[PDB]
From a paper:
The APTX RNA‐DNA deadenylase protects genome integrity and corrects abortive DNA ligation arising during ribonucleotide excision repair and base excision DNA repair, and APTX human mutations cause the neurodegenerative disorder ataxia with oculomotor ataxia 1 (AOA1).
We obtained crystals diffracting to 2.4 Å resolution that contain two APTX catalytic domain (APTXcat, residues 165–342) protomers engaging a doubly nicked target structure. Successful crystallization strategies ultimately utilized a concatemerized nick substrate with a 6 bp upstream and 8 bp downstream duplexes. In addition, a 5′‐ribonucleotide is positioned at the nick junction. In this configuration, the structural snapshots captured in our crystal structures are representative of APTX bound to a nicked RNA‐5′‐3′‐DNA junction reaction product complex formed by APTX during repair of abortive ligation products created during ribonucleotide excision repair (RER) (Tumbale et al, 2014; Schellenberg et al, 2015). The structure reveals how APTX induces large‐scale DNA duplex substrate distortions in order to access the 5′‐terminal adenylated lesion in the context of a nicked duplex. The major molecular interface at the DNA nick is mediated by the amino‐terminal HIT domain α‐helix (α1) that infiltrates the DNA base stack. The protein displaces the upstream half of the nick and unwinds both the 3′ and 5′ sides of the nick. This has two effects: First, extraction of the 5′‐terminus facilitates positioning of the adenylated lesion into the active site; and second, disruption of the 3′‐terminal side of the nick exposes the 3′ end. In each of the complexes captured in our crystals, abrupt DNA bending is governed by the APTX amino‐terminal helix, as previously hypothesized (Tumbale et al, 2011). This structure illuminates how APTX senses DNA damage through two discontinuous nucleic acid binding sub‐sites, dictated by both the HIT and Znf domains which together collaborate to sense the nick.
Numbering used by the authors:
A (entry chain A): 165 to 339
B (entry chain B): 163 to 340
Amino acid sequence: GHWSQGLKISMQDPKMQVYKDEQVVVIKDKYPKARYHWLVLPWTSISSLKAVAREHLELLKHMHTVGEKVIVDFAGSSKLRFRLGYHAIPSMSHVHLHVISQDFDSPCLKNKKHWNSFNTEYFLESQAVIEMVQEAGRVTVRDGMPELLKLPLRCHECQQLLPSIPQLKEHLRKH
Amino acid sequence: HMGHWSQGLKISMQDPKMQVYKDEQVVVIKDKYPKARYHWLVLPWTSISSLKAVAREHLELLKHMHTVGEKVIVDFAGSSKLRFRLGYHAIPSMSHVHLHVISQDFDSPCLKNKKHWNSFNTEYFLESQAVIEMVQEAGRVTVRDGMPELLKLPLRCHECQQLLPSIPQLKEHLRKHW
DNA sequence: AACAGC
DNA sequence: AACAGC
Ligand SMILES: Nc1ncnc2c1ncn2[C@@H]1O[C@H](COP(=O)(O)O)[C@@H](O)[C@H]1O
Ligand SMILES: Nc1ncnc2c1ncn2[C@@H]1O[C@H](COP(=O)(O)O)[C@@H](O)[C@H]1O
Ligand SMILES: [Zn+2]
Ligand SMILES: [Zn+2]
């Protein structure tokens, strides 16, 4: 479906370009799952994590550095915590780096898949991906990622199990 | 002060037809809505308002209630080989403190919602022995905070610790341990 | 009105 | 006193 190309379309639209250089583009996540949620995409598209090889190393490092720069330039005075990583089995085409604040306070965060895709090992940290390409030369993704998306809701700050999304969002207010 | 319905245990325990066991100290009745194949309530003739009211004077009575519970198990469920737990609900709904004696099959149609499950499978369920130890060491029973929150915890099998998303799936899962 | 978009 | 039946 044409919906899966949204990232390539949006990153080519100057009105959506939070940041741009000769290597990458940054856009706001159209349906953000937190107060701050950006996506970093390279101009030279990569199909999936399986296609990543050592030639992509510096680019991945650049995507990480740019993500941290966007935090400084557009959320510097914030005390929030941030994580940078990739979804093991994404839905939108063209690999993209998630840069998202750990409040997870947003109406677009609506279901269990949303939560677990940022708060389970389904969320592959950027620094860990960079490490695999630097040493092994490829990105290895363990099995069972679809099951992680169906796990009961667990708080990422205190590890408490919650029974529903609404009760989770109320719990997050304590942190 | 709650309505007349909360006195059902006092009315039922005085009915000889409901008495599974009786002595000068305690009485045993079958739970009217059992949450397992075997489910009894042990109540003293000298009623206790709540766990907060328990003092060292009730210690021997509490141990007698426990021992009687253990005897009812062997007398009426000895051939079942089922596991049992003895404890009190931290925040009961029926008046008059009563000791739960329940088999761990949890195979019953009266078990219908999460509150039922977590009332017997979280810290909401205070083991009889633990209650006895507190009264022994400290002379009173202390209920920890956050009990209403425990009743909302996702369903967890008490045998293999697996988390289940619904009651019907839990009942189906429990088959594997019978 | 219908529909491909390289 | 509980409790259908209105
Ligand atoms: N047109 C778009 N522009 C920006 N972000 C988008 C767009 N469409 C989807 N997204 C986001 O991209 C992410 C795709 O998820 P995933 O495929 O798991 O990486 C989600 O956070 C979506 O909200
Ligand atoms: N008339 C009754 N006779 C025997 N058990 C009852 C009766 N009414 C309620 N119960 C049980 O007493 C318990 C009351 O809940 P709790 O106050 O949490 O111990 C539940 O297990 C009920 O099924
Ligand atoms: Zn928490
Ligand atoms: Zn189990």
